[PDB]
Amino acid sequence: RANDAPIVLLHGFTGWGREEMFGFKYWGGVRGDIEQWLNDNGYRTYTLAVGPLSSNWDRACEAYAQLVGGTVDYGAAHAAKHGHARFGRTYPGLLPELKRGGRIHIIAHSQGGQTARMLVSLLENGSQEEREYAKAHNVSLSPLFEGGHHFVLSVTTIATPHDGTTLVNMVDFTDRFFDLQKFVLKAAAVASNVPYTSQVYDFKLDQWGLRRQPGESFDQYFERLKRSPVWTSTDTARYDLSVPGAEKLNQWVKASPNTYYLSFATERTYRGALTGNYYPELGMNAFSAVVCAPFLGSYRNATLGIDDRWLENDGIVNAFSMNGPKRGSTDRIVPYDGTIKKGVWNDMGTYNVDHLEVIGVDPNPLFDIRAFYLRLAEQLASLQPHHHHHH
Ligand SMILES: [Ca+2]
Ligand SMILES: [Zn+2]
């Protein structure tokens, strides 16, 4: 143990707070409670919950406020550009200590990894556009946009589409994506054709002024979201998840030299006998198996750059996209050699588990999830806050 930094957990295009889904955890799912496990083992751990469908930017803003406390500030320039609210939900702050020189490890899953990267970039570099806009229009400016924060010792990504996922190319992606949401609700024993009066799954679309109404089931709510700016505008997860969107995000979201980055790739497919195509293995979550993997494993696009290396997948994301950003990126990626190097992506390899199995939302008895996270935690705790140069 070289550091006492707490661990913070962060979800992707699906996810919810510890008090949502009747307690079914995004981090653990049918297997348990990952956060609890870490805590019980001596690793202080917290959980962030942000908009699942929102843009990484929105998410980052939300994360910052959820960490330090206060009212979400999306940036005047940003809000005016995308025509959504500047200020959002107020949070009590999970870790005030950050504002006193404390540091955290972020463990992110899926799109959460893009969000984590973005958060570190904003914390350290702020946003020039925001600074300049504040100065020309005489509006206040969130600390998040000034730069100079050192809050993050490390970022670990699991099954993150750093270069996007081809899933979004599906002609029917709109319908299937939401079907995936319903699937996850199903996993938690929640029906989508029911108007639960209870919260259940808050998409936190405060900036857009959207929320499930009384008498409105998720099926009906999603129909509405599909036609809303959270689905039709570039300031969305849908955009950032795409290959072009991810590359655009990679053009400015760089690895900080002061933070350690670890990536974990996932794969649950096999290569066909007479084709470079990939197919879903036995055990893969039912949804992905039928609806997503076949596409991910057979889809190519030369103009875009999507070739045979992109076909191996975890049912939702292309494994090629997971070791770290590459398209439009200046970041470096190094295969793990037994030493975790700072300011670069330490590619920890590929694990044989699906997008949902990795977090416990889909079962997989052959995957010792408790040990995986515990080992991870142990590794993060061994990170030195000062690496001495040596032979
Ligand atoms: Ca399984
Ligand atoms: Zn936004």
UniProtKB/TrEMBL annotation:
GO terms for biological process: lipid catabolic process. InterPro entries: AB_hydrolase_fold (IPR029058), Lip-like_C (IPR056304). Keywords: Calcium, Hydrolase, Lipid degradation, Lipid metabolism, Metal-binding, Secreted, Signal, Zinc. Residues 3-365 form the Lipase-like C-terminal domain. Transmembrane segments: none annotated. This is triacylglycerol lipase. It comes from the Bacteria. PANTHER family: ALPHA/BETA-HYDROLASES SUPERFAMILY PROTEIN (PTHR34043), ALPHA_BETA-HYDROLASES SUPERFAMILY PROTEIN (PTHR34043:SF3). The keyword Oxidoreductase does not apply. Signal peptide: none annotated. It catalyses: a triacylglycerol + H2O = a diacylglycerol + a fatty acid + H(+). It is an enzyme of class 3 (hydrolase). Ca(2+) binds at residues 283, 357, 362-363. Pfam families: Lip_C. The lineage of its organism: Bacteria, Bacillati, Bacillota, Bacilli, Bacillales. Zn(2+) binds at residues 58, 78, 84, 235. It is found in: Secreted.
